[PDB]
Each structure stands twice: as structure tokens, then as C-alpha cells.
Design a protein around this ligand. Structure first.
Ligand code: CLA
Ligand code: CLA
Ligand SMILES: CCCCCCCCCCCCCCCCCC(=O)OC[C@H](CO[C@@H]1O[C@H](CO)[C@H](O)[C@H](O)[C@H]1O)OC(=O)CCCCCCCCCCCCCCCCC
Ligand code: HEM
Ligand SMILES: CC1=C(/C=C/C(C)=C/C=C/C(C)=C/C=C/C=C(C)/C=C/C=C(C)/C=C/C2=C(C)CCCC2(C)C)C(C)(C)CCC1
Ligand SMILES: [Ca+2]
Ligand SMILES: [Cl-]
Lengths: 56, 97, 56, 243, 137
């Protein structure tokens, strides 16, 4: 929702689609990924999140 | 480079029309007058180089020819795909309701 | 292949498996009971019988 | 004359008919007459698999195997046109019948080799000028070997060609490239070869029997691995008829 | 929502005429469909040939058209394949084959009309469930 808000504000101010999305911090996009949702694990899937989907 | 041949075929006319060379026989229920009599004759006499060649099946009645002519716009032909015609799959492709 | 007991079985005439192979590279041989597997099983059963005798 | 109740559970249903030792006659071919094989039967007695070359790249041999799928191996009730060609050779054009059997044989050491033992779409021809079918007649030809599994077959992870997942869903974030061969199912279609050697002919009834040897590829698991080369040997029976 | 006269209003023929069934005819139709047809046609499908269902759109494209009372009543007397090409009374329940399908022996013309009306009304109630099979259960 916040990502979309920011993109719409960029577009409203005259940015191109490429520019609007390029202005989204990588840190914000990363929170919008289910691999970082804590309800996606397994009891015996041991270790860091990096051991699963990999090091981002 | 490995390809799923059925998915690939869905991007041809096979994905848009009844392919006289490949489509399973139940597809002919879609249009008036084709099933089961003509459907059986069509599958039995496949493959066809062109759609109009379906009109050349021996023994047809004039009525049958006319039904075929009215339905050519719903037919296509593409290369025979082994995966779709083996296993007697044109007659029963493992799909019911 | 780091085989230690296999050569001792082979040295005295145990050369085939119940699975059909022989250490000389033959196929479709029937080794009878005294395959490598039969030898192993015989030793396990002997172990058990000696264990029971020890208890007595 | 044996009934189903005489045969059931004996193993005889998987055997081809035999002809006795007196059947060494000749069956005349009238080149003006049309003919059919009303029944072709093939009973395999041995399955041989070509060992995969160690890397010496000498001649890899065909080795014996153990049948594990029981008395379920024979091809039978096969019928087709027997054409008389202009040079006097005969050509059998297989039309229909129980013309395939899945078969699993096991190599020494346990490797199981499934194959679709088949003569699907067999076109087999004799030598020229066969004015009679005799114990000197042979048929040689080729057939089609379609994929051992057909397009709906789903692997243990639910993946298939005409149905199923198209990915390894249990490894949601694995790199796809290494798994492409397992994920993308392919449907094999290759050729096999067969020789039929007539050993017995009943001139009066049109019945012939003999030995066969066929060569074909085994199952490739919808493109997941390389097939093996198989050689099948056995006995055959055919009834020739004017039609 | 109610079972209204409009829900109960279905095509009588191919020529634009309708008939409004009574609530009692609807009940009779369900009962008789269950009695004579549901063993194969439960929920609008066909168990012995799932390619052909009792959906209204499907019945409309049948030959002769079967998406009306007359078409269905005629089907129950003299059933045909989907293209009208062969008469199938010998393998499909009908009045003509009441000798070999004994449940058809006590069906009256009135009964056939009730069954026909059931086949047309049910999808108006059930939508995709009618002729949908297990996917829509
Ligand atoms: C509050 C406790 C706690 C929590 C929440 C964590 C959390 C974490 N640790 Mg730490 N850790 C702890 C205490 C804890 N630790 C202790 C006490 C030690 C010393 C052993 C460690 C040493 C440690 C190491 C060396 C590592 C971690 C790592 C991790 C991460 C992976 C966790 C994992 O894979 O677990 C897996 C959990 C399980 C498989 C569940 C175990 C359930 C047991 C076996 C049940 C036993 C049942 C019992 C026998 C039944 C009895 C029945 C009877 C009554 C009848 C995670 C952030 C990993 C990491 O990524 O490091 C950077 C890592 O490498 N931890
Ligand atoms: C019951 C009879 C029996 C038989 C037929 C076998 C057979 C076999 N065993 Mg088993 N075994 C047995 C009992 C038996 N075993 C018992 C009771 C034990 C527990 C001690 C074992 C423990 C055992 C081990 C640990 C191993 C075997 C192994 C083997 C294989 C190789 C044998 C070998 O090289 O011997 C070699 C034996 C000798 C060289 C004997 C030496 C005799 C000394 C020098 C005698 C000296 C004293 C004498 C009194 C001197 C005076 C002599 C006089 C005539 C002048 C062969 C399949 C091998 C194998 O392949 O395992 C799978 C192996 O590693 N066995
Ligand atoms: C005194 C002697 C003590 C000896 C200890 C005995 C050892 C027994 C083994 C304990 C079982 C745990 C093994 C887990 C499997 C494993 O290998 O983990 C291995 C993991 C490490 O995870 C590893 O990480 C690596 C990178 O660091 C790599 O990614 C590896 O792939 C990954 O396996 O070890 C732990 O995480 C231990 C901490 C676990 C804490 C979780 C808290 C939840 C506990 C609450 C449960 C209470 C239950 C009570 C019920 C009654
Ligand atoms: C009196 C009760 C029945 C009625 C009113 C009825 C109605 C119909 C109708 C209208 C169709 C045509 C479907 C279409 O055009 O889309 C049909 C087809 C069919 N029904 Fe029934 N049916 C009845 C009983 C049964 C029973 C008991 C069976 C099973 C034994 C059955 C099996 C079939 C089959 C196999 C078809 C397809 C026939 C073909 O076209 O080859 N029906 N039925
Ligand atoms: C001849 C021969 C051989 C050999 C053999 C052998 C070597 C044997 C043995 C044996 C043995 C080695 C035996 C044994 C045994 C035993 C026993 C018989 C036991 C017992 C017991 C008991 C009875 C006990 C009891 C008890 C218990 C359990 C617990 C506690 C208490 C009591 C004490 C009561 C061979 C194969 C080469 C080949 C051919 C021939
Ligand atoms: Ca010969
Ligand atoms: Cl449908």
C-alpha cells in the first residue's frame, strides 16, 4: 500500500513509470516479499532465512 | 532447450479452435450437429493438410457436407502432436466433469 | 572403493550377489545362498545365537 | 477344445499357440488374392538389456535380466493387411490389437528397466518372390515405440506433460535451471526393429509359427533419463487368411 | 429469494412460447427426475457419458433442440444422439423402450412435462452447479 502510494505520488508529480518505480527504496520493496513473513517457516527448517531463499 | 509441447501448442490455433489433427473428440460437442457422427469420421480420417480437406471424407451425405461447411470457421489444422494423439487420447483424454 | 571384508569373502570363493552380479563382472549368475548377503546374514544370526549362549 | 475355466490361472493365456513338428508344409500365395493376418501373437521368452559402456568404448553386450511383472508380456489378437507386392514380396501392415505390454525387467544388482514392449504400427516385409510361405520365409520390419507413460502421467511430485505442476513446488525458491529436465516432461517417439523367422507352416490352415527377435528402446521417464537398448526374443504365431 | 412464477417460466417450444409451471409441478418434476433419471443424471451431469450434460446451453445446441418442454418431452419418448442422427431408445430410458426400462412404464405425459420442467428450472436456481459436477459441489 505504501509502495503504491509513493509510486502514485511520483506519477502525479510528472515522473515516468520507470522513474516512479526506480524511486522505491530496495529496503521497502524487500519488506513486501513473503520470504520475509515470519509465518512462512517450518519447525525443523533450521537456521537463517538466507539458508532458504538465499542471500538477497 | 526443453519445451512442454502441449503448452506450446496452446499458443497456436490449437488453443483457439478445434484442431482436426489433434483436439480430443469431446470438443465437437461445442457446435450443433458435429457429435458423435461427424466427430468420429473426422478423428478417424485425420490428419488433414487443410481444414477444407474434411469435406473429402468418403461416404458423407449432402447434409453432413453442409454442416461441415458451416463449421469450417471453427476448425483449424496444425502439425500432429504425438503427445495428444497417442494413448487413444483423442477418444478419451482422461477428462470427465 | 575402500572395501575391507569384501576381498576376504572373494578370496575363499564368495564372488556373487543375490542381486545377480559377480565381482568378476558377470551378469545373471546364481550364487545360491552363499552370496555376500548370505555370508553377512549367517554372521548376524551366529552373533545372536552366541549372545543367547553367553546369557545361559 | 479348452475353455476359459480350463485356462484361467495356469499361465497358458500368456502363451502363443504352437504347431506340432509335422507342420513343415507350404502355404500358397495367389498374387491376385487379398490377404490378412487374422491373429498375430508374440510371446517373449527372454529380455536382454545392453549394459551401459563403462567408458572403455568397446562393444557393450546385451545381458540377461529377470522379469518382475509376471505373465503379462505377450502381444496378441493383432490383425492387419498382408499385401502381395509387385516383386512377389509380402508386406504385413499392422492395423490393431493388443500390440503393446509394459514390462519391467531387473538387471543383476537391482536396476529395474521398464519398457513398452510393442509392435505398434508394424510394417514387416518378406524377401521378393514368395510364391508360398514356407519354413524359409522371414519377415523383417519396423514399428513405433511411443513414450512408456502417456501425456497425463503425473510424477510423484505432481508434475506432468498434459497435466500437473510445471515446477518443483516443494522448493518454492530453488533456481529452476538445474531442475528443468525433471520439470519439463517430454514425450518420446522412436523406432524399433523386428525379425520374424518362420519355423513351422500348416499349408492347409494358413497357420505359421516361429521365433522372433526385436530391438527397441526402454522407458526414458518422460525425458528425465536416457533409455536403455533392449533386445526381446521369443516365439510367434500367425494365422493367414484370404480376405 | 423465492421460487417465483418467473423462475418457473420456461420455454414451451422453439417458437418463443413459454409455460409457467406451478409449484406442485416443480415438486413433481424433482420427484420424478429423482425416480427415473438421477441414477445417471444427478445434479445435471451424465454418469455413463460425462461429455453430455443437462445444461440449458448444451440442450439448445442439441439436434433437434432440447432446450424447451417439447424438445425434452420428445427426448423422453424417442431419445437421439446429440446430432439427432441415431435413435437410442434401446440403451436410453424412454416411453418407446418402457419394456426394457420398466420405470418408464408408469410415466404419463403429465409426468414427462414435469420432468422436462425440472431440467429447465434447476439451472435457473443452481447456476453452474447444474451440470457442473464435483468442481461446483
Ligand atoms: C529462546 C530460545 C532460543 C531461540 C528462539 C533461538 C533462535 C535462533 N537461533 Mg539460537 N540458541 C539457543 C537459544 C535460542 N535460539 C541456545 C540455548 C543455544 C545453545 C544450544 C543456541 C545456539 C544457536 C546456534 C549455534 C545457532 C542458533 C541459530 C538460531 C536461529 C535458528 C533457530 C533454529 O533453527 O531452531 C531450530 C529449532 C528446532 C529444530 C526445535 C527444537 C525442538 C526440540 C528438539 C524439542 C525437544 C522435545 C523434547 C525432547 C520432548 C520431551 C518429551 C518428554 C517431556 C516426555 C534462530 C534465530 C542459528 C543461526 O542462524 O545462527 C546465526 C545457529 O546457527 N542458535
Ligand atoms: C562357523 C564357521 C564360520 C565360517 C565358515 C566363516 C566364514 C567366513 N568368515 Mg566368519 N566368523 C566366525 C565363523 C565363521 N566364519 C566366528 C565364530 C567369528 C567370531 C570370531 C567370525 C568372525 C569373522 C570376521 C571378523 C571376519 C570373518 C570373515 C569370514 C570370511 C573369510 C574367512 C577368512 O579369511 O578366515 C581367515 C582365518 C584364518 C586365517 C584362521 C587362522 C588360524 C590361526 C593361524 C590358528 C592358530 C591356532 C591354531 C590352534 C594353531 C595350530 C594349528 C594346527 C593345525 C597345527 C568367510 C566368509 C571375514 C569377512 O569377510 O567378513 C564378512 C572377516 O573379516 N568372520
Ligand atoms: C550438556 C550436553 C548438551 C548437549 C545438547 C544435546 C544436543 C541434542 C540435539 C538437540 C535437538 C535440536 C537439534 C535441532 C536440529 C539442528 O540441527 O539445528 C541446527 C540449528 C542451527 O541451524 C543451522 O544453521 C547453520 C548456519 O548457522 C546452517 O544454516 C544450517 O543449515 C542450519 O541447520 O541449531 C539451533 O538453531 C539451535 C537453537 C534452537 C533454539 C530454538 C528454540 C526453540 C526451543 C523450544 C522447544 C522447547 C520444547 C520443549 C518440549 C517439552
Ligand atoms: C427419464 C429420465 C431421463 C431423462 C429425462 C434423461 C434426459 C436426457 C437428455 C435430455 C439427454 C440429452 C443431453 C443433451 O442433449 O445435452 C440425455 C442424454 C443421455 N442420458 Fe439421459 N435421461 C434420463 C435417464 C437416463 C438414465 C437412467 C441414464 C443411465 C442409464 C441416462 C444416460 C444418458 C446417456 C448415456 C446420454 C447421452 C446419450 C447419447 O447422446 O449418446 N439417462 N438424457
Ligand atoms: C554345521 C554347519 C554349519 C555351522 C553351524 C554352526 C556354526 C552352528 C552353531 C550354533 C550355535 C552357535 C548355537 C547356539 C546356541 C544357543 C542357545 C541354544 C542358547 C540358548 C539359550 C538360552 C536358553 C538362554 C536363556 C536365558 C535367557 C535368554 C536370559 C537369562 C536367563 C536364561 C539363562 C534362562 C554351517 C552353517 C557352516 C554350514 C553347514 C553345517
Ligand atoms: Ca526358418
Ligand atoms: Cl462443458
Amino acid at each position: 500500500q505504501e509502495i503504491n502510494r509513493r509510486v502514485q505520488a511520483s506519477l502525479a508529480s510528472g515522473a515516468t513509470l520507470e522513474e516512479a518505480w526506480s524511486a522505491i527504496p530496495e529496503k521497502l520493496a524487500f519488506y513486501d516479499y513473503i520470504g520475509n513473513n515470519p509465518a512462512k517457516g517450518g519447525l525443523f527448517r533450521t537456521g537463517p532465512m538466507n539458508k532458504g531463499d538465499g542471500i538477497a | 532447450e526443453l519445451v512442454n509441447v502441449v503448452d506450446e501448442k496452446l499458443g497456436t490455433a490449437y488453443g483457439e479452435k478445434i484442431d482436426l489433427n489433434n483436439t480430443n473428440i469431446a470438443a465437437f460437442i461445442q457446435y450443433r450437429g458435429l457429435y458423435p457422427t461427424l466427430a468420429k469420421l473426422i478423428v478417424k480420417n485425420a490428419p488433414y493438410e487443410s481444414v477444407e480437406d474434411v469435406l473429402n471424407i468418403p461416404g458423407l451425405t449432402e447434409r453432413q457436407k453442409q454442416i461441415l461447411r458451416e463449421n469450417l470457421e471453427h476448425f483449424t489444422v496444425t502439425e500432429v502432436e504425438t503427445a495428444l494423439v497417442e494413448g487413444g487420447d483423442r477418444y478419451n483424454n482422461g477428462l470427465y466433469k | 572403493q575402500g572395501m575391507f571384508v569384501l576381498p576376504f569373502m572373494a578370496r575363499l570363493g564368495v564372488t556373487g550377489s543375490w542381486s545377480g552380479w559377480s565381482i568378476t563382472g558377470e551378469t545373471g549368475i546364481d550364487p545360491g545362498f552363499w552370496s555376500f548377503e548370505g555370508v553377512a546374514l549367517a554372521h548376524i544370526v551366529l552373533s545372536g545365537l552366541l549372545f543367547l549362549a553367553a546369557c545361559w | 477344445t479348452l475353455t476359459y475355466d480350463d485356462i484361467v490361472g495356469t499361465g497358458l493365456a500368456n502363451k502363443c499357440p504352437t504347431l506340432d513338428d509335422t507342420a513343415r508344409g507350404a502355404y500358397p500365395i495367389d498374387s491376385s488374392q487379398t490377404y490378412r493376418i487374422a491373429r498375430l501373437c508374440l510371446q517373449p521368452t527372454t529380455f536382454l538389456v545392453k549394459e551401459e559402456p563403462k567408458n572403455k568404448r568397446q562393444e557393450a553386450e546385451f545381458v540377461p535380466t529377470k522379469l518382475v511383472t509376471r505373465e503379462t508380456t505377450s502381444l496378441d489378437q493383432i490383425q492387419g493387411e498382408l499385401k502381395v507386392n509387385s516383386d512377389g514380396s509380402l508386406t504385413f501392415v499392422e492395423e490393431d490389437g493388443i500390440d503393446f505390454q509394459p514390462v519391467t525387467v531387473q538387471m543383476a544388482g537391482g536396476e529395474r528397466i521398464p519398457l513398452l514392449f510393442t509392435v505398434k504400427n508394424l510394417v514387416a516385409s518378406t524377401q521378393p518372390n514368395v510364391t508360398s510361405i514356407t519354413t524359409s520365409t522371414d519377415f523383417k520390419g519396423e514399428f513405433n515405440v511411443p513414450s512408456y507413460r502417456t501425456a497425463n502421467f503425473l510424477d510423484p511430485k505432481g508434475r506432468g506433460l498434459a497435466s500437473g505442476y510445471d515446477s518443483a513446488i516443494a522448493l518454492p525458491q530453488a533456481k529452476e535451471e538445474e531442475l528443468a529436465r525433471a520439470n519439463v516432461k517430454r514425450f518420446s517417439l522412436t523406432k524399433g526393429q523386428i525379425s520374424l523367422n518362420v519355423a513351422k507352416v500348416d499349408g492347409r490352415t494358413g497357420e505359421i509359427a516361429g521365433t522372433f527377435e526385436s530391438e527397441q528402446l526402454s522407458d526414458d521417464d518422460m525425458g528425465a533419463h536416457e533409455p536403455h537398448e533392449v533386445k526381446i526374443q521369443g516365439v510367434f504365431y500367425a494365422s493367414i487368411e484370404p480376405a | 429469494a423465492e421460487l417465483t412464477p418467473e423462475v418457473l417460466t420456461v420455454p414451451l417450444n422453439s417458437e418463443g412460447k413459454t409455460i409457467t409451471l406451478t409449484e406442485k409441478q416443480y415438486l413433481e418434476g424433482k420427484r420424478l427426475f429423482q425416480y427415473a433419471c438421477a441414477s445417471c443424471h444427478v445434479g445435471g451431469i451424465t454418469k455413463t457419458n460425462p461429455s453430455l450434460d443437462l445444461r440449458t446451453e448444451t440442450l439448445a445446441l442439441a439436434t433437434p433442440p432440447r432446450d424447451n418442454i417439447e424438445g425434452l418431452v420428445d427426448y423422453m419418448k424417442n431419445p437421439t444422439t446429440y446430432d439427432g442422427e441415431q435413435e437410442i431408445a434401446e440403451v436410453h430410458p424412454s416411453l418407446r423402450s418402457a419394456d426394457i426400462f420398466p420405470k418408464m412404464r408408469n410415466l404419463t405425459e403429465k409426468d414427462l412435462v414435469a420432468i422436462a420442467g425440472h431440467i429447465l428450472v434447476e439451472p435457473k436456481i443452481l447456476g453452474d452447479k447444474w451440470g457442473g459436477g464435483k468442481v461446483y459441489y
